[PDB]
Amino acid sequence: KGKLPPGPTPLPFIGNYLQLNTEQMYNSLMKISERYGPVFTIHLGPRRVVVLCGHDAVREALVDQAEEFSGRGEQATFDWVFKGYGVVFSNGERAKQLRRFSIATLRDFGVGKRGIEERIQEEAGFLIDALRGTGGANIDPTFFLSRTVSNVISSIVFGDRFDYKDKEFLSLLRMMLGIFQFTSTSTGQLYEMFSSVMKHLPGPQQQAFQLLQGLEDFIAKKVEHNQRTLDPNSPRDFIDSFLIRMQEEEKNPNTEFYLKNLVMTTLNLFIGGTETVSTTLRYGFLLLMKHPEVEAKVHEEIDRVIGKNRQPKFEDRAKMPYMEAVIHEIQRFGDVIPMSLARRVKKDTKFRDFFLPKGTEVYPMLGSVLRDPSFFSNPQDFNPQHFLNEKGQFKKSDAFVPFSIGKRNCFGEGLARMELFLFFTTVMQNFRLKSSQSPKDIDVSPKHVGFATIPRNYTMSFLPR
Numbered sequence: 396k397g398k399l400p401p402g403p404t405p406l407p408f409i410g411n412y413l414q415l416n417t418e419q420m421y422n423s424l425m426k427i428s429e430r431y432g433p434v435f436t437i438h439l440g441p442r443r444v445v446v447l448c449g450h451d452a453v454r455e456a457l458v459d460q461a462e463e464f465s466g467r468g469e470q471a472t473f474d475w476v477f478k479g480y481g482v483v484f485s486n487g488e489r490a491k492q493l494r495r496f497s498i499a500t501l502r503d504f505g506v507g508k509r510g511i512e513e514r515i516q517e518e519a520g521f522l523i524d525a526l527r528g529t530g531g532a533n534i535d536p537t538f539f540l541s542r543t544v545s546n547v548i549s550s551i552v553f554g555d556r557f558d559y560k561d562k563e564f565l566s567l568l569r570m571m572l573g574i575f576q577f578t579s580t581s582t583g584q585l586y587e588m589f590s591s592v593m594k595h596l597p598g599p600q601q602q603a604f605q606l607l608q609g610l611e612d613f614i615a616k617k618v619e620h621n622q623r624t625l626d627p628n629s630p631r632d633f634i635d636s637f638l639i640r641m642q643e644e645e646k647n648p649n650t651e652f653y654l655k656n657l658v659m660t661t662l663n664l665f666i667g668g669t670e671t672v673s674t675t676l677r678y679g680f681l682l683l684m685k686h687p688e689v690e691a692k693v694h695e696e697i698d699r700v701i702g703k704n705r706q707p708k709f710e711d712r713a714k715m716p717y718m719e720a721v722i723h724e725i726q727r728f729g730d731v732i733p734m735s736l737a738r739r740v741k742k743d744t745k746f747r748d749f750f751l752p753k754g755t756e757v758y759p760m761l762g763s764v765l766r767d768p769s770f771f772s773n774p775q776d777f778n779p780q781h782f783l784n785e786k787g788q789f790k791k792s793d794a795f796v797p798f799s800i801g802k803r804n805c806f807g808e809g810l811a812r813m814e815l816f817l818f819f820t821t822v823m824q825n826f827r828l829k830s831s832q833s834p835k836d837i838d839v840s841p842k843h844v845g846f847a848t849i850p851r852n853y854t855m856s857f858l859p860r
């Protein structure tokens with residue numbers, strides 16, 4: 396046809412705003428999908444976006460035409476501070492350069508090796524101590540979990556972990572939680588459409604920018620310190636490595652290795668490597684309390700395979716199919732980044748029967764793939780069986796795409812999975828979960844859903860076993 400995917404007729408500037416509920420972007424788009432198809436065009440304010448719903452559409456584009464869909468789209472709130480710099484929100488040469496270096500440097504500091512595994516085990520140990528410190532009292536787990544998670548990636552980029560009593564550390568975690576919630580509210584999704592006006596208007600978006608600026612200032616501060624103490628022969632962390640590469644590229648006019656890309660890339664890892672996993676853990680514990688039978692089987696498998704003495708190690712996952720199914724189901728049900736991070740066609744593209752002009756933005760609806768009724772029998776329920784065969788053995792699914800897929804997929808996936816398995820397992824090994832209310836009354840529906848899926852606030856107690 397040579398034409399863009401079908402979709403509701405947009406109005407000047409506001410686009411399809413009148414046919415969308417900013418507080419429920421996902422449901423609005425899915426409803427529109429019922430009449431236009433799994434592949435349609437939507438106008439988020441002036442942003443023309445091609446929406447991909449369901450496993451087939453998403454995989455066909457991001458994997459089968461991986462290079463064509465390898466461009467990075469926008470996320471207005473984050474672009475406020477990033478401005479196209481850094482590894483995540485960058486495109487072309489800058490993205491290729493920063494991503495290759497980041498993956499390599501991450502591996503140099505233990506990611507994927509025994510080095511980081513030991514780091515996660517030790518930090519898991521610190522979480523256990525902290526949980527024991529609550530004396531079984533009812534608590535908000537939120538920051539107990541984010542502190543532990545953040546310390547893993549923090550060890551890599553800053554060279555050392557934060558003290559759990561570090562007030563400034565708590566401030567930063569609050570900033571990350573704040574930005575994740577904002578981008579998932581009605582105002583945050585409205586911002587994605589009308590940032591051209593809103594970035595200049597009073598409102599919640601301004602407070603959001605301040606949280607981001609607070610994070611950037613902290614990073615800039617850390618970089619400055621490392622600069623005034625850098626050992627070119629012995630890098631201490633991710634920042635040092637980049638600083639070294641920068642020195643080596645000082646004679647290259649068009650190098651991508653300069654201060655701003657260092658600050659933004661480090662900020663990317665600090666935020667991206669913290670809040671995502673933290674959120675998953677938080678939702679996970681809530682779901683396990685909502686389903687005692689699942690916790691029971693988890694404990695059964697842990698006691699048998701690992702016991703009550705030694706610390707869980709990453710290799711234990713191979714001998715624990717149920718736990719593997721449980722973590723997968725948590726990520727599937729959790730649907731933490733419901734619409735992924737926007738992609739964009741790098742050149743004129745022919746997708747299925749449509750035409751996508753170069754630069755077109757793309758919304759891979761990851762949540763629609765994680766609940767694709769063709770891949771999971773009861774997508775709306777939380778059931779580990781979704782990842783298990785009759786034999787109780789772990790069964791993979793092509794529809795398991797919480798980290799997205801393709802050329803700009805999450806390269807933090809390996810670390811994330813090691814953290815999820817080690818933290819979930821070490822916690823369940825040591826504690827029994829006690830909810831504030833009867834299971835049947837626990838609400839596992841999300842508090843907010845926009846850029847991310849945010850679970851409702853809750854308290855709980857960790858009872859030693």
Ligand code: HEM
Nearest residue numbers: 483667668671672732735736797798799803804805807811
């Ligand atoms: C449960 C945890 C996590 C989830 C659900 C998650 C999810 C995602 C998603 C959906 C994307 C976009 C993929 C795409 O464009 O196709 C992504 C990007 C990215 N993630 Fe994660 N992530 C997680 C953890 C991590 C961790 C631990 C790190 C940091 C070490 C990290 C770093 C990144 C980076 C740097 C990108 C941008 C990649 C690029 O543009 O080339 N993520 N993540």
Ligand SMILES: NCc1ccc(-c2cccnc2)o1
Nearest residue numbers: 473483662663666667668671
């Ligand atoms: N790891 C995926 C993910 C979710 C949100 C973000 C993020 C947000 C702000 C800056 N850099 C990365 O990254």
